[PDB]
Amino acid sequence: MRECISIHVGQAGVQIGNACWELYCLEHGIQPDGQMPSDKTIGGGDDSFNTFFSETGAGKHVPRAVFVDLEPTVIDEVRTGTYRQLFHPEQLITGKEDAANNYARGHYTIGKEIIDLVLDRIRKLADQCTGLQGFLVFHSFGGGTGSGFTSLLMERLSVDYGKKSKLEFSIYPAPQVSTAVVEPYNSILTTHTTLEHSDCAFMVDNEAIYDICRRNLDIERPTYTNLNRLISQIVSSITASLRFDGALNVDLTEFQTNLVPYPRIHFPLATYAPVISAEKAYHEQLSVAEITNACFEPANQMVKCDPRHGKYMACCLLYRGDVVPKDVNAAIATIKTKRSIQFVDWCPTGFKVGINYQPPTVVPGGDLAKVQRAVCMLSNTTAIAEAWARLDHKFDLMYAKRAFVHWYVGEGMEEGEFSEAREDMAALEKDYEEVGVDSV
Amino acid sequence: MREIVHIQAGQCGNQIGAKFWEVISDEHGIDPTGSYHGDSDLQLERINVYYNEATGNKYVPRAILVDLEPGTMDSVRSGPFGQIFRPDNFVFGQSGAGNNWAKGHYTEGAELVDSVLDVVRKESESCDCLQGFQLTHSLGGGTGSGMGTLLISKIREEYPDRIMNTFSVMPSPKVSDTVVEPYNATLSVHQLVENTDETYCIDNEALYDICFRTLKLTTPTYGDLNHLVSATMSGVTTCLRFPGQLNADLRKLAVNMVPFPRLHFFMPGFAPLLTVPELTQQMFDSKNMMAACDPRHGRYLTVAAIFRGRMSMKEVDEQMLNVQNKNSSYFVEWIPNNVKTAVCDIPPRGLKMSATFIGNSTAIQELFKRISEQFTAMFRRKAFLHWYTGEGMDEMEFTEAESNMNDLVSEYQQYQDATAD
Amino acid sequence: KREHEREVIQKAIEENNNFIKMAKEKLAQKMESNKENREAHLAAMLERLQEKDKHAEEVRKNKELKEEASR
Ligand SMILES: Nc1nc2c(ncn2[C@@H]2O[C@H](COP(=O)(O)OP(=O)(O)OP(=O)(O)O)[C@@H](O)[C@H]2O)c(=O)[nH]1
Numbered sequence: 001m002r003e004c005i006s007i008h009v010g011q012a013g014v015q016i017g018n019a020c021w022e023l024y025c026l027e028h029g030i031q032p033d034g035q036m037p038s039d040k041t042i043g044g045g046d047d048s049f050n051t052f053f054s055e056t057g058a059g060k061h062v063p064r065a066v067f068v069d070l071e072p073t074v075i076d077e078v079r080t081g082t083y084r085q086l087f088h089p090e091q092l093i094t095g096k097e098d099a100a101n102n103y104a105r106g107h108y109t110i111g112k113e114i115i116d117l118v119l120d121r122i123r124k125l126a127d128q129c130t131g132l133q134g135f136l137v138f139h140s141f142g143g144g145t146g147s148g149f150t151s152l153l154m155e156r157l158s159v160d161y162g163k164k165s166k167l168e169f170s171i172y173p174a175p176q177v178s179t180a181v182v183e184p185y186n187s188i189l190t191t192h193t194t195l196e197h198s199d200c201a202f203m204v205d206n207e208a209i210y211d212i213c214r215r216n217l218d219i220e221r222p223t224y225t226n227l228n229r230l231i232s233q234i235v236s237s238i239t240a241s242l243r244f245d246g247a248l249n250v251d252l253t254e255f256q257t258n259l260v261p262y263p264r265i266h267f268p269l270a271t272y273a274p275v276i277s278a279e280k281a282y283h284e285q286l287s288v289a290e291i292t293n294a295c296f297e298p299a300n301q302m303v304k305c306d307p308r309h310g311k312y313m314a315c316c317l318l319y320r321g322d323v324v325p326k327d328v329n330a331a332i333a334t335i336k337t338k339r340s341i342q343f344v345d346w347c348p349t350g351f352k353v354g355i356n357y358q359p360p361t362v363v364p365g366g367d368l369a370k371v372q373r374a375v376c377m378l379s380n381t382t383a384i385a386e387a388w389a390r391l392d393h394k395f396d397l398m399y400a401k402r403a404f405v406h407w408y409v410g411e412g413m414e415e416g417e418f419s420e421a422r423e424d425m426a427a428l429e430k431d432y433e434e435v436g437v438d439s440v
Numbered sequence: 441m442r443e444i445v446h447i448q449a450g451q452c453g454n455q456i457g458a459k460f461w462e463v464i465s466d467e468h469g470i471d472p473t474g475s476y477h478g479d480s481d482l483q484l485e486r487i488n489v490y491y492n493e494a495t496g497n498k499y500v501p502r503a504i505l506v507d508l509e510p511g512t513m514d515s516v517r518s519g520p521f522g523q524i525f526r527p528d529n530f531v532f533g534q535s536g537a538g539n540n541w542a543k544g545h546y547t548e549g550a551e552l553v554d555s556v557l558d559v560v561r562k563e564s565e566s567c568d569c570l571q572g573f574q575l576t577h578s579l580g581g582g583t584g585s586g587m588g589t590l591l592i593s594k595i596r597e598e599y600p601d602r603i604m605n606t607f608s609v610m611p612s613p614k615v616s617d618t619v620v621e622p623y624n625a626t627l628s629v630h631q632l633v634e635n636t637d638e639t640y641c642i643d644n645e646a647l648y649d650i651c652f653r654t655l656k657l658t659t660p661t662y663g664d665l666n667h668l669v670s671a672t673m674s675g676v677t678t679c680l681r682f683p684g685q686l687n688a689d690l691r692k693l694a695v696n697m698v699p700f701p702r703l704h705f706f707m708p709g710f711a712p713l714l715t716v717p718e719l720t721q722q723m724f725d726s727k728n729m730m731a732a733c734d735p736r737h738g739r740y741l742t743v744a745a746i747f748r749g750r751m752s753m754k755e756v757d758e759q760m761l762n763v764q765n766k767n768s769s770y771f772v773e774w775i776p777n778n779v780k781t782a783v784c785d786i787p788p789r790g791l792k793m794s795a796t797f798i799g800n801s802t803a804i805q806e807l808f809k810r811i812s813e814q815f816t817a818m819f820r821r822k823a824f825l826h827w828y829t830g831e832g833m834d835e836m837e838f839t840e841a842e843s844n845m846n847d848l849v850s851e852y853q854q855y856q857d858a859t860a861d
Numbered sequence: 862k863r864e865h866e867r868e869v870i871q872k873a874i875e876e877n878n879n880f881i882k883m884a885k886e887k888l889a890q891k892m893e894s895n896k897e898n899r900e901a902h903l904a905a906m907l908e909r910l911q912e913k914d915k916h917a918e919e920v921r922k923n924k925e926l927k928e929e930a931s932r
Pocket residue numbers: 009010011012013015016069070071098099100101102140141142143144145146147171172173174177178179183206224225227228231
């Protein structure tokens with residue numbers, strides 16, 4: 001019951017999936033061969049961690065996950081890597097030719113050749129669920145597969161699973177590690193196409209994560225490995241309510257109730273703390289008050305934007321580790337006085353708190369220090385629209401000259417799809433303005 | 441594997457092609473007998489891009505050698521890496537092209553093209569996932585220019601959804617005194633604008649000037665010029681041949697470099713000809729360009745930069761930012777983030793560090809304006825036209841070629857002058 | 862009240878089914894439009910290439926006449 005299926009699409013989605021599932025295994029005590037000595041019910045059960053892992057009669061704990069990519073080389077590393085025994089071969093799906101950073105090839109030319117097989121593989125995971133809750137979809141905005149194939153898959157999932165909830169973790173592009181000039185095109189195309197098919201999407205700005213690694217972990221030139229280990233801690237914080245249980249645990253769907261006031265306004269801003277190196281953590285124990293204060297430092301946000309210049313429609317605090325309500329309440333009171341969080345006038349101003357007592361975990365050989373307590377803030381702020389505005393501006397500069405558009409038209413797309421997507425983004429930006437205006 | 445099929449046509453094409461295979465064979469640890477004798481697994485990671493794997497652990501360049509006379513290929517076969525090429529991939533005629541684009545494209549070349557296609561088909565049919573083709577040739581001769589562009593059109597008919605990439609050697613009076621080179625070059629460019637996805641403009645004018653001015657060679661030889669060409673070709677194919685994130689195959693390269701289908705003529709560059717700041721500054725200096733064009737006479741649509749060797753990635757990132765910021769006027773503002781940078785740990789032979797530059801600059805119009813000026817100077821007096829009409833050509837085809845190349849110049853100027861506001 | 866309760870749940874069923882139906886139809890129209898557009902572009906490319914081959918025939922037929930007619 002309450003199973004969740006994860007779908008990792010394209011290089012970014014797959015490599016972030018690698019990091020997440022490795023971290024889940026460490027959190028739950030699951031070995032690389034899938035054995036979990038602590039689980040005394042063999043071949044099944046309804047424990048919290050069973051939302052993310054099925055079980056075989058031989059005691060293997062198998063991620064409820066599909067990895068899909070239109071070329072083989074990234075998923076091939078999963079097939080030969082440390083956690084290869086974790087997955088059945090059928091969960092790792094690859095084509096031979098990728099989308100060449102082209103939404104049109106991911107959604108149409110190449111993607112259409114593998115979509116039926118992917119849905120078939122997803123259906124086999126669903127059929128093993130007694131109460132499937134929904135999907136978690138990991139992908140880049142910028143790649144041809146992450147953009148085009150994800151939108152195709154999300155459309156097909158709406159048809160095949162109705163209004164079953166679909167959540168996204170979406171990698172927003174940054175020039176420091178981007179690989180295509182057309183990533184603004186792919187980003188707008190997929191955001192337009194997926195908007196009505198996604199219930200909630202957590203954008204991760206690669207530049208925000210890059211800056212955090214540089215500034216907080218003293219990493220000179222962060223790699224995807226550096227970025228993905230930090231991303232997995234945020235993902236783990238968000239999903240920990242699904243995988244563990246406890247008295248103070250609050251289900252992600254309960255936060256979602258507060259986070260999504262209108263169907264299109266479904267893009268929470270995540271902020272995570274503490275991100276500190278072993279060298280700095282050695283001296284200092286970071287208290288509940290300290291990590292809570294850090295949640296309101298813009299430098300710790302997963303998306304670059306200024307919430308001080310916007311209005312809040314929700315604020316959720318997801319704590320994990322050595323944390324008790326008394327300290328949270330005190331920390332929040334201090335922040336209410338010294339910070340002037342401004343809410344829109346139509347929603348309550350309380351902060352919604354959950355606590356998972358399971359302590360945070362780190363992967364061996366990483367840069368993050370192991371800490372006794374951590375927190376992920378999820379806020380619904382009008383400021384997140386600033387991320388759309390930066391993308392829309394880059395889209396506009398190129399599209400005015402129709403630069404690179406022939407690559408999409410050559411694959412069967414029409415200019416009408418670009419303007420339709422951009423108009424949808426203009427309406428979304430307008431939506432975020434409207435919800436921030438005071439009532440009558 | 442994403443295989444590339446290599447074709448080299450004519451004297452220049454086979455000469456440049458042979459050196460290319462010598463250089464990258466050395467880089468991948470392949471010896472003249474086809475056996476691997478390297479030290480790093482990175483050398484074999486993507487070896488299938490350019491080599492077939494035969495029994496006995498033999499690596500055979502996926503390469504086809506075309507020419508209408510036997511001479512050049514005979515010396516290739518007895519060259520350094522002659523025995524490495526597949527004997528059956530040599531396709532040569534006898535009549536020769538006589539430096540006549542019409543003979544290469546319409547007559548002698550047309551009688552041989554079917555034989556070449558048979559070899560292309562056999563190489564492509566055993567490809568796991570064919571990327572496309574790369575052609576080496578000159579534009580000033582007869583076989584490489586005329587038959588080379590014919591091969592492109594015929595291949596495109598059978599592989600219309602594959603990338604076509606050429607290394608095209610532009611003629612200069614400083615290297616060859618053959619008078620009808622501007623005719624052959626203009627007729628060839630007429631084809632390249634329509635039927636290739638990306639063309640590296642290897643300009644003998646720039647190669648001579650580099651050797652004479654910079655390297656101080658009073659009398660540069662084709663060997664000297666080809667040293668520059670092979671080092672450049674190695675550089676611009678590094679991202680295709682080694683594991684990496686950026687421009688790792690022909691199609692992603694084109695998607696990053698070609699904002700409008702006709703503007704696909706690249707200005708390559710190489711440094712050095714040493715610190716990371718100096719390497720980047722050199723890389724953007726006109727003296728280091730393999731096309732005789734000054735980038736400060738135009739604006740960059742897109743740029744690819746490849747650094748090779750052990751160096752600070754942080755410093756490369758800072759210096760590439762610094763160069764763009766201080767030269768912002770020369771990068772079109774309506775293509776954000778149009779300069780992409782890749783780093784390869786493996787340096788080229790004989791250097792601790794190197795940089796290779798691929799620019800899509802509107803200043804490439806200077807190259808075409810030079811060819812056009814020489815073309816019209818001969819065409820205004822209908823000089824030497826009988827060599828071409830004698831093959832069946834009508835002078836209207838010359839007018840259309842001239843016109844199409846003039847339109848290309850106007851097109852590069854349109855986007856040079858375009859503004860964001 | 863019972864009849865209203867029935868109308869609420871059948872309204873929810875109707876809306877979900879119309880959402881599924883509309884997504885299915887839009888996707889079919891998109892995939893067929895794209896398929897037709899790409900096929901047309903490939904056809905135009907080959908037709909131009911075929912025009913070149915026709916022109917090649919006229920060229921060789923022009924040399925044939927020049928040579929035999931004059932000699
Ligand atoms: N955070 C993070 N970002 C990544 C990673 N890999 C790629 N990206 C980003 O994703 C975007 C490129 O998309 P990819 O996921 O690599 O492309 P793809 O989905 O495989 O699509 P195609 O390769 O075009 O078929 C760029 O913005 C990259 O910076 C990763 O491992 N972690």
